[PDB]
Amino acid sequence: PRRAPAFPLSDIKAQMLFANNIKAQQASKRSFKEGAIETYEGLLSVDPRFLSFKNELSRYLTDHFPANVDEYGRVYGNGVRTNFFGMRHMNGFPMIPATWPLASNLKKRADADLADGPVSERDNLLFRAAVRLMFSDLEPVPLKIRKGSSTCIPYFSNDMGTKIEIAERALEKAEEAGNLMLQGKFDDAYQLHQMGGAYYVVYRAQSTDAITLDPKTGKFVSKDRMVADFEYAVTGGEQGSLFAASKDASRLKEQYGIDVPDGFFCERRRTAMGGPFALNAPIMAVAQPVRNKIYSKYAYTFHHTTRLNKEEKVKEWSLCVATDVSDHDTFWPGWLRDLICDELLNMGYAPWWVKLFETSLKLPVYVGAPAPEQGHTLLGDPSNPDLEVGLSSGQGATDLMGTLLMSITYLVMQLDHTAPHLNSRIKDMPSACRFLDSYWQGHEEIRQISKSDDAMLGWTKGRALVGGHRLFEMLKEGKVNPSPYMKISYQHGGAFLGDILLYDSRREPGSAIFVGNINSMLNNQFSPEYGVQSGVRDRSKRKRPFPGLAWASMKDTYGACPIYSDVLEAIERCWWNAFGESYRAYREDMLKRDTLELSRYVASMARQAGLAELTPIDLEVLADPNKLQYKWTEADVSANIHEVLMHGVSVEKTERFLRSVMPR
DNA sequence: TTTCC
């Protein structure tokens, strides 16, 4: 089954992905690199006092606060869903190798027993229904841009001036490009408007993966993360091998002299795809209006913020099932892409825009550097984009693509297993829409809250309920997959968008509460995804602009965990053991410094406020803006705070652009 | 200078 074309950096096909400037050339050549991160200023992730601290802390908590999770996967008691060994990683040092992106997932999906299209007319109706509800009656907004992000292929600029320039130009030429594409003239489209080429595969860290402590061994054991080699990825898993990356940290002593305590490992690595910006611009301009619609009209199932926000919806349920999906992104079906593109055409969207959109979801990928002596290889032909990688991380609508898939999938699961008496209501398109419209507002007997694959599925009182409980039982035994479309299962330790649902002895939603995930406080504070980048002097451009600020939001975020107090205390104690410092002091110090330095970037303060008008959301986002693109959205952040991190584009120009794109 | 709501 179609092997994918592969090209080497040397090849003209690859050469043309990188413009004649130094940054772009350097991107194409970039080699496997690694090294201890600067966890906080002047502190390395492998500093022996720090590692000693992680050894003591991690053990102490695992010991005194073992997970309270039932059978079932509801958490109770202490609010701990797992051990605390997650912090035992040499942050900045990757597992070897990273995976190669699969060029085609059709086999992956076939072997997994997953449908290659809607299976029943009902589902086909519901998927198109979801397209219609989401992409209709949209309100124009200005295209926002992360400060310091890359335009990737082919210029690799972080100059806002140049980004705005590119974006604006892209909205003008979007139409010619799509039409060109409609004519099969992809190369022309890429050469004239930089729309096409490929994704740039950047490997990012997941600093905290599973590590258990073997009862029989006494040795810690790292979770095995499976990865593909070149052959696997090009052949969709026909040839080649799929195997376990090595997290073994011993190489760290031999190579770099670094001292490696027992039970510490190299970090997991997630592949990440950077989009050609000229192509993503036209897409983001529409994606954001769509996000806006769903978080307004279908706020029930889609718009989540405060822990009380979630609790209010769920407490009304008789049953709450916490699902989750395995490797959602690599599994995501291209048939969905096509269907989405189809109904969008039927709604009367611009054919040339649906074509841009379509293409963005079948684009080749530039594989950079999964390992030493590896990478620098283009997968797929940009002349005729035909890759089926699943969902490309930096596509511009990837949250929405995920949401579309999983929201319907989930509803379907509910129907199939719990609410047959509901099918008579989904006869045609209009009836389907009205049903979906109702379902999403939370007006039916089956309910759902979700962001992409993370969901909690809900049953009120009624006929579905009994079915609900069986579904839940089906999910526990785990012998049979409840969906035709994706591999679904119950979360072992139920939690939604970061907050744990804390059940009491009743084990019912009614007497359940949302508290923060204490383990997340730890991951965030001692195992950050990036270093502090103290070389970057413009902090709005740093991955972690104002680390110290999280101290001020700690109480609001995590103060509701049953063991909050005890955890801060254990830290203090272990930190004193390891540093002869008050950890608390060191934070309050850093809180102060970053608070001053902030007034600089928010002239709209600007010192004298003091931490002022800032909500907890702001404070966590300032310390970690990576929370814009998974947890919170625009209108959850104060407007003068947004403009520190983001930058807009001529509203006239988006407004003009949108108009030529949409039906009405 | 490293992509993603």
Ligand SMILES: Nc1nc2c(ncn2[C@@H]2O[C@H](COP(=O)(O)OP(=O)(O)OP(=O)(O)O)[C@@H](O)[C@H]2O)c(=O)[nH]1
């Ligand atoms: N919000 C948020 N999510 C994270 C963070 N780190 C990891 N994740 C999420 O954790 C999820 C783990 O997904 P998987 O790749 O399937 O790992 P897994 O849940 O163990 O999957 P299985 O191997 O099937 O058990 C990812 O999809 C991420 O979205 C983080 O720092 N913040």
